[PDB]
Homo-oligomer: A and B are copies of this chain.
Amino acid sequence: EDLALRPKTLDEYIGQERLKQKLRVYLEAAKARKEPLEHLLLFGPPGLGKTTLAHVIAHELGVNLRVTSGPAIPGDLAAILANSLEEGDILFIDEIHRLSRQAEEHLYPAMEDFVMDRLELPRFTLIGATTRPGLITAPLLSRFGIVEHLEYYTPEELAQGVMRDARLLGVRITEEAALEIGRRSRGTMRVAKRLFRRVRDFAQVAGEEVITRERALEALAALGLDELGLEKRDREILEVLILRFGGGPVGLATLATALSEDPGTLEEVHEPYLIRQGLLKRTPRGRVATELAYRHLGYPPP
């Protein structure tokens, strides 16, 4: 029924250790003096645990959470702040970058002092989660007390997440299988959950009841994933670059035409992970395959 298995306690939250230290310090300090938290902002690549952390913060402060969104919302944002906002409650605006300039101009004046345009608003904390903080206007971006950045997870944390999701769903999986699924993940929790669900479907169709390590490996091979998590399309991109063009500078148009691919999807979907993993370089004369790409595909380095 539910596949987005969100943890509810900060102890169930897994991977953001250096963020968790500061968050625990701030939350203990705010609870010690019976004072509401400062305004908080979360940003990072998609799928890393912004909304989950907002809900966990709401639970840990022990108050209610009022969830809204930027696309959902100028004259509207002045209503939720007073109509259904209690003292100490948290207002969570997910995807806050989409919020209008006029709507933003009616939000930060109510952030420094809890009054609008007098009407006394109760003590409240604003939590904003977005992928593009650069779209938030400087006046609104300057009244955020805490600004935090979400980092990529290590394979062990991804394995822990896979095991927890398996236990909640009711699937018997081994430590090594979860480690393999986490290793093949792209440092992202959502990718790990998706890969685990695909392996679960493969095992269920095959009739297996326990996902042993070899069963996980064969399921991932059927999915078409390397030891680095590369799909078939990424491997084909690297192979075309190495063979058809000698691995030297190519360019976006030439490489896209050779691969029967759109240049935009080659540049904004497939390339970033190869660049992160060190299998590709964006030389000013074009794209270049690194020695790691040569050795990963079983080719003699130049």
What residues on B are CB-neighbors of A254 within 8 Å? Answer: 282
Contact with B along A1-29 (1 / 0, CB 8 A): 10110000000000000000110011011
27 contacts between A and B (CB under 8 A): A1-B123, A3-B38, A28-B205, A29-B200, A29-B205, A33-B204, A46-B142, A67-B118, A69-B105, A69-B106, A72-B106, A94-B108, A94-B109, A95-B105, A98-B101, A98-B102, A132-B265, A134-B262, A134-B263, A134-B264, A141-B269, A142-B188, A145-B194, A253-B267, A257-B272, A258-B275, A258-B276
Least CB distance, A230 to chain B, in whole angstroms: 14
Residue of B68, B101, B123, B201 touching A117 (CB-CB under 8 A):
B68
The chain B residue sitting closest to A222, CB to CB, is B22
A164 located at the interface, meaning its Cβ lies under 8 Å from any Cβ of chain B in the complex? no
**In contact, A46 and B139 (Cβ under 8 angstroms):** yes
A214 located at the interface, meaning its Cβ lies under 8 Å from any Cβ of chain B in the complex? no
A47 located at the interface, meaning its Cβ lies under 8 Å from any Cβ of chain B in the complex? yes
Cα distance A190–B26 when bound, in Å?
A: 18
Cα distance A260–B118 when bound, in Å?
A: 32
A135 located at the interface, meaning its Cβ lies under 8 Å from any Cβ of chain B in the complex? yes
A223 located at the interface, meaning its Cβ lies under 8 Å from any Cβ of chain B in the complex? yes
Secondary structure type dominating chain A contacts:
helix
**Docked complex: A246-266 residues within 8 A CB-CB of B:** 248-249, 253-254, 257-258, 260, 262-266
Question: A113-B4, A190-B142 are contacts. A25–B134 as well, Cβ < 8 Å?
Answer: no
Cα distance A275–B245 when bound, in Å?
A: 12
A45 located at the interface, meaning its Cβ lies under 8 Å from any Cβ of chain B in the complex? yes
A284 located at the interface, meaning its Cβ lies under 8 Å from any Cβ of chain B in the complex? yes
Question: A112-B4, A118-B67, A260-B276 are contacts. A201–B105 as well, Cβ < 8 Å?
Answer: no
